[PDB]
Design a protein around this ligand. Structure first.
Ligand SMILES: O=C(c1cc(Cc2n[nH]c(=O)c3ccccc23)ccc1F)N1CCN(C(=O)C2CC2)CC1
Ligand SMILES: [Zn+2]
Length: 210
């Protein structure tokens, strides 16, 4: 059973989440087609996801990865956008639904830039936008994204497409780094659902630039 705990805006924990969300917005190559046009979000609320069973699976794997990486689990807080956010907060991430179409193959994808995750909230390339207005740039409808704890362990650096089914030998994750001819922004990939915990559930709106 998942329990959603509201965080007060005056709480330093709420402020840290909003600060990372706002500060990591960037301009995307698609000129805002997938996620919309905006320089800031309006944060509606931030809830902590509490689930004992999911936490135990996460901590158990974190100990295993720590033992395989000279006692460093290498956790990072990263964003994830998905139309299936309800299933994620109740059952956790699931590699059985890993992104077949991804540049690093069938893994679970995360971004260090909140605006890159916002491109996936309504589907691949923003699908057809919000259910109500069918607008990928809707300023009215409340969106939701996750800010997750992700166990990276020994991360495998890549610049180019390399379709994998699992992390490479001796590794626990794959990080696609930006390059002039390749990625504009980073992407973090894990191949096991228990290497991520959906810590924060952010409800927000993109704001129309003035
Ligand atoms: O990893 C994906 C996934 C990711 C993407 C890409 C993606 N999605 N979301 C992001 O924030 C992101 C950031 C950087 C680069 C790519 C992304 C597309 C379709 C997908 F199925 N999954 C889909 C949602 N997940 C689940 O376990 C759902 C509940 C069944 C986790 C696995
Ligand atoms: Zn809308």
């Amino acid at each position: 059973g998942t329990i959603l705990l509201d965080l007060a805006p005056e709480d330093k924990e709420y402020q840290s989440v909003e600060e990372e969300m706002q500060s990591t917005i960037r301009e995307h190559r698609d000129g805002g087609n997938a996620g919309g046009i905006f320089n800031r979000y309006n944060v509606i609320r931030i809830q902590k996801v509490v689930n004992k069973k999911l936490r135990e699976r996460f901590c158990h794997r974190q100990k295993e990865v720590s033992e395989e990486n000279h006692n460093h689990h290498n956790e990072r807080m990263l964003f994830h956008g998905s139309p299936f956010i309800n299933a994620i907060i109740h059952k956790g991430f699931d590699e059985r639904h890993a992104y077949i179409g991804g540049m690093f193959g069938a893994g679970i994808y995360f971004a260090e830039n909140s605006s890159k995750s916002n491109q996936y909230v309504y589907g691949i390339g923003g699908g057809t936008g919000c259910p109500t207005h069918k607008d990928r740039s809707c300023y009215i409808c409340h969106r939701q994204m996750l800010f997750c704890r992700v166990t990276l362990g020994k991360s495998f650096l890549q610049f180019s497409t390399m379709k994998m089914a699992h992390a490479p030998p001796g590794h626990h994750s794959v990080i696609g780094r930006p390059s002039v001819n390749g990625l504009a922004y980073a992407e973090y990939v894990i191949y096991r659902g228990e290497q991520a915990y959906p810590e924060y559930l952010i409800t927000y709106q993109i704001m129309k630039p003035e």
